[PDB]
């Protein structure tokens, strides 16, 4: 393994040389269309989205109704629920909004609290929801996956990104 | 060298027809791999034009 022997070997080399798994495309996916998103909508909420909605003082369900021009159904999982519960006292009013009979709790079977992994598993397994967030790396992840409606918070209200039915 | 065995009739037609089929498939496989390599080199030129 001497270096000059390696030198001779690379010169000889240059002189001589000179069960799998494929996840299916979803049946509800025309080329980038995602025709399966019709009213009523089914949306998925993030802690960042909650706290920034408090900051911009917008109403949650009224805000998504006026932004999306129809009826919409809100969902949070146990990962983001435990994430709010971990944030705790300063966001106790955020917990008070997150506990509501109008928001429908969705269960999960996960080990840890990585709501990023939880939600990205959800969207990689379903492709029927609308994600509502503010986070940058997760935003880039849901951007690099195609055919899915991102809605972020910013400015005076919410903003939709990928839904073709903007109006 | 090959083994020298005499064959009569039907088996000679079997080997002749099956070597016809082998040469057909050899030509078709060579055509598939040349078309595939041409697609690779054009894809590589377009990847270069898009990276730079």
């Amino acid at each position: 393994a001497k270096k000059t022997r390696k030198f001779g070997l690379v010169k000889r080399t240059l002189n001589t040389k000179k069960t799998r798994n494929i996840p299916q495309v979803s049946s509800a996916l025309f080329f980038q269309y995602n025709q399966a998103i019709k009213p009523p909508y089914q949306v998925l909420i993030d802690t960042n989205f909650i706290n920034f909605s408090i900051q911009k003082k917008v109403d949650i369900v009224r805000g998504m109704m006026d932004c999306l021009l129809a009826k919409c159904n809100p969902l949070i999982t146990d990962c983001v629920m435990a994430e709010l519960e971990k944030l705790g006292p300063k966001y106790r009013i955020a917990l008070k909004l997150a506990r509501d009979p109008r928001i429908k709790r969705l269960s999960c079977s996960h080990k840890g609290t990585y709501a990023d992994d939880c939600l990205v598993h959800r969207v990689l397994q379903h492709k029927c929801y609308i994600v509502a967030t503010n986070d940058a790396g997760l935003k880039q992840r849901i951007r690099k996956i195609p055919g899915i409606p991102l809605m972020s918070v910013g400015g005076h209200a919410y903003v939709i990104e990928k839904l073709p039915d903007v109006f | 060298a090959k083994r020298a065995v005499v064959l009569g009739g039907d088996e000679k037609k079997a080997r002749s027809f099956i070597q016809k089929v082998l040469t057909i498939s050899k030509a078709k496989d060579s055509k598939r791999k040349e078309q595939k390599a041409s697609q690779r080199k054009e894809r590589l030129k377009k990847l270069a034009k898009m990276e730079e």
Binding site: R12, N15 | A1, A4
Partner: peptide, 28 residues
């Protein structure tokens, strides 16, 4: 091949250093 011919190194020991017309074909 010319380079390997120059550096043959003639002291290598490898263990593998110890190993009618149709009528004639039918015979053989």
């Amino acid at each position: 091949l010319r380079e390997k011919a120059k550096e043959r190194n003639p002291d290598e020991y490898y263990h593998a250093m110890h190993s009618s017309m149709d009528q004639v074909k039918l015979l053989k």
